[PDB]
Amino acid sequence: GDVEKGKKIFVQKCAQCHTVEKGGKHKTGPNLHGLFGRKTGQAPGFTYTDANKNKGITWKEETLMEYLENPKKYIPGTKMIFAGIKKKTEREDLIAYLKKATNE
Ligand code: HEC
């Protein structure tokens, strides 16, 4: 993906509820630093729904590609409000940006 476009997408569609920087505060949603290779529902200090807490998957590109297309469908009962990113290219860009920034 295009990391720069991914950043734009993050700023426009995710930043209002999430941070990606280390020690960034929990907002409406959990901080996403260290997201890749981590199980669902594990950010310490965030109170998840039971659905998100017990989804039982590992966040990585494949799982993010599916989630971000339609969060509700992938984790029914999530309290995250997001319709989904319908275009594959934009999803890849965002995911590529998150892969960089959440490990940075
Ligand atoms: C508020 C309006 C949000 C927007 C916009 C986005 N997210 Fe979100 N996200 C939000 C909440 C409240 C939660 C917790 C959900 C629950 O049911 O407990 C989430 C959760 C996630 C997760 C899962 C993280 C985990 O630790 O398991 C991810 C990966 C995530 N959110 C990513 C994400 C992205 C990439 C967004 C923009 C594309 C985005 N979210 C928007 C609240 C909100």
Curated annotation (Swiss-Prot):
Record-listed heme c binding positions: 14, 17-18, 80
Residues bearing the modification N6-succinyllysine: 55, 72
UniProt-annotated location(s): Mitochondrion intermembrane space
One MF term in the entry's GO annotations: electron transfer activity
SUPFAM superfamilies: Cytochrome c
Keyword vocabulary terms for this entry: Acetylation, Apoptosis, Electron transport, Heme, Iron, Metal-binding, Mitochondrion, Phosphoprotein, Respiratory chain, Transport
Domain of life assignment: Eukaryota
Keyword set includes Iron: yes
GO biological process terms on file: apoptotic signaling pathway; cytochrome c-heme linkage; mitochondrial electron transport, cytochrome c to oxygen; mitochondrial electron transport, ubiquinol to cytochrome c
KW DNA repair (keyword) present: no
Primary role: Electron carrier protein. The oxidized form of the cytochrome c heme group can accept an electron from the heme group of the cytochrome c1 subunit of cytochrome reductase. Cytochrome c then transfers this electron to the cytochrome oxidase complex, the final protein carrier in the mitochondrial electron-transport chain. Plays a role in apoptosis. Suppression of the anti-apoptotic members or activation of the pro-apoptotic members of the Bcl-2 family leads to altered mitochondrial membrane permeability resulting in release of cytochrome c into the cytosol. Binding of cytochrome c to Apaf-1 triggers the activation of caspase-9, which then accelerates apoptosis by activating other caspases.
Family membership noted in the UniProt record: Belongs to the cytochrome c family.
Descriptive protein name: Cytochrome c
